[PDB]
Amino acid sequence: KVGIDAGGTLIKIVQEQRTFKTELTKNIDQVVEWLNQQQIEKLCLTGGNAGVIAENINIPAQIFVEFDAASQGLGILLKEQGHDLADYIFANVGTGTSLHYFDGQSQRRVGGIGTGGGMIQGLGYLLSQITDYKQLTDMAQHGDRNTIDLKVRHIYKDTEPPIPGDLTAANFGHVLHHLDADFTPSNKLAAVIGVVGEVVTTMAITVAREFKTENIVYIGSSFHNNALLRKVVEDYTVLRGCKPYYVENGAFSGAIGALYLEKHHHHHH
Amino acid sequence: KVGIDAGGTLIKIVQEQRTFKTELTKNIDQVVEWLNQQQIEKLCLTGGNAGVIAENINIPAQIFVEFDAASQGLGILLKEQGHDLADYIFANVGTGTSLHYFDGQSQRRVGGIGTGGGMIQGLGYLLSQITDYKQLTDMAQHGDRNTIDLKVRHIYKDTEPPIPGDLTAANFGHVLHHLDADFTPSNKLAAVIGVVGEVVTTMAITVAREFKTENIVYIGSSFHNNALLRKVVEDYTVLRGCKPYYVENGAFSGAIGALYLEKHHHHHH
Ligand SMILES: Nc1ncnc2c1ncn2[C@@H]1O[C@H](COP(=O)(O)OP(=O)(O)O)[C@@H](O)[C@H]1O
Ligand SMILES: Nc1ncnc2c1ncn2[C@@H]1O[C@H](COP(=O)(O)OP(=O)(O)O)[C@@H](O)[C@H]1O
Ligand SMILES: COCCCCCNC(=O)CCNC(=O)[C@H](O)C(C)(C)COP(=O)(O)O
Ligand SMILES: COCCCCCNC(=O)CCNC(=O)[C@H](O)C(C)(C)COP(=O)(O)O
Ligand SMILES: [Mg+2]
Ligand SMILES: [Mg+2]
Secondary structure, eight states: OEEEEEOSSEEEEEEOOOEEEEEEGGGHHHHHHHHHTSOOSOEEEESTTHHHHHHTOOSOEEEOOHHHHHHHHHHHHHHHTTOOOSOEEEEEESSSEEEEEEOSSOEEEEEEESOSHHHHHHHHHHHHOOOOHHHHHHHHTTOOOTTTOEEHHHHHTTSOOSSOTTSEEETTTTGGGOTTSOOOHHHHHHHHHHHHHHHHHHHHHHHHHHTTOOEEEEESGGGTTOHHHHHHHHHHHHHTTOEEEEOTTGGGHHHHHHHHHHHHHOOOO | OEEEEEOSSEEEEEEOOOEEEEEEGGGHHHHHHHHHTSOOSOEEEESTTHHHHHHTOOSOEEEOOHHHHHHHHHHHHHHHTTOOOSOEEEEEESSSEEEEEEOSSOEEEEEEESOSHHHHHHHHHHHHOOOOHHHHHHHHTTOOOTTTOEEHHHHHTTSOOSSOTTSEEETTTTGGGOTTSOOOHHHHHHHHHHHHHHHHHHHHHHHHHHTTOOEEEEESGGGTTOHHHHHHHHHHHHHTTOEEEEOTTGGGHHHHHHHHHHHHHOOOO
């Protein structure tokens, strides 16, 4: 069997040892072409575009809701990778961002936000005219956010501030103080990644506090080829007294979960 | 006496009936010029740039921390305007955004984020080259976000989604699906206001849930001349089962609070 998580931007495919593959959601027809060349008895599907695959191929399919599939696959990966966490927030930073509290037994969605990988690509395109994901993310890595973002220390100056001075006070809030600066593509893109990372993290640490867990597990393809994003998120998570976890193949959590859920759907009473 | 909240972008001045005035923080020297033409016995100061005013003029001054000054002024304005709220979140959407829980007696800061008025101006400048605040905000009001923002309904298509289809899934996440669109200045600016409003609101409703209040009071100068921002925030607050409140002269809460705190600082035992 095959597990497929057909998301808003990427289609994640898991073949069973696991073989991992991705395809762009825009190229969903090419996934169907690939499937038609395999010897597959059943599709285990999840994600927003699961229905599009199912209706376009004659292989029997079963669909699972992404939140439960992602939680189940993530729980499997965490254990494989040596983590025995009692509870955690997980933040699925996909095309958009979905936040979940896992209490040790099951997941509940506790929030979400439109700041995620889609914004990185879209706002990154508006600021740089780069459409290629590897080019965009590579360009951002070494950007300097200092002429773009305002820190608390910039507002309070010689007065000791009421919250730590190094914190971002206003994303893009320094632009009007640097109107003669060279706002390079790298610098602008670093600031896009900065705001996305800071928003995701802020929401994750807030729901971590609300649900009384110190653990925050970050998954999603948005971290791929984006070490800057991983650092923005890791650093701020630690600053706010929580423990960040990244997961090898975590972006395939849903696909793994779909396979697992299909397998255990069979029972009787 | 005079109350002055010298913030990151605007200096809010209250003279006592109240007279309200603003000046750009960049023009802080002109506030000092104005002060030197008045007959003022004492300055009641708050905000990040309070120290700059105090060190540049010979009028006796007392400084108050903005969070307590804002809370106190807001509590005064709410009562003046007929609201007797038992508790509430207040979201101070200034150059950046600071979030507070007021339990009926005092405030505590419960979060914050760099998505606020500074981002509107800075990212708005990067996308439109407009520096004038009235021009920028006026241009945004009637922008169409539909080719820029991705909704849940766009990902899930003919499948009923696990969360409501009209929700923003990814700010700027539709850009790559509309690469031949005319991304007009109005449309781009509406999307900037959209992401700021949605992030602020998301954080406000999350801490409202955490601290068990249905009331969210929004203050800050970021709402001035920005009906779109007010609508984005109001609508999403209501959708998430909370009650939004806007306050006449709410952006002057800190200045009013500074005057009040100075007046009642005098006591003995
Ligand atoms: N090869 C790639 N092409 C396009 N986007 C990519 C790629 N690798 C990583 N990404 C990033 O990952 C995001 C998608 O994350 P993912 O978790 O797969 O979301 P979804 O389930 O919505 O498809 C993209 O918006 C982009 O930021
Ligand atoms: N006349 C104006 N000039 C510049 N910005 C304005 C003006 N009116 C409203 N704003 C908006 O209000 C924001 C500042 O809000 P405010 O609550 O005064 O913050 P601060 O206390 O940091 O100065 C600006 O970033 C901008 O979005
Ligand atoms: C009108 O909209 C007001 C603001 C809504 C803000 C909150 N938005 C959300 O919670 C949706 C965020 N996005 C997500 O949760 C995900 O992108 C999903 C829609 C679940 C789709 O999953 P994926 O394709 O993996 O990103
Ligand atoms: C390194 O930074 C990591 C991310 C930090 C994100 C959180 N940032 C914050 O909480 C600061 C948000 N901004 C604010 O609270 C306000 O702008 C203040 C700094 C209090 C200044 O007040 P004002 O001038 O009125 O906006
Ligand atoms: Mg996904
Ligand atoms: Mg302020």
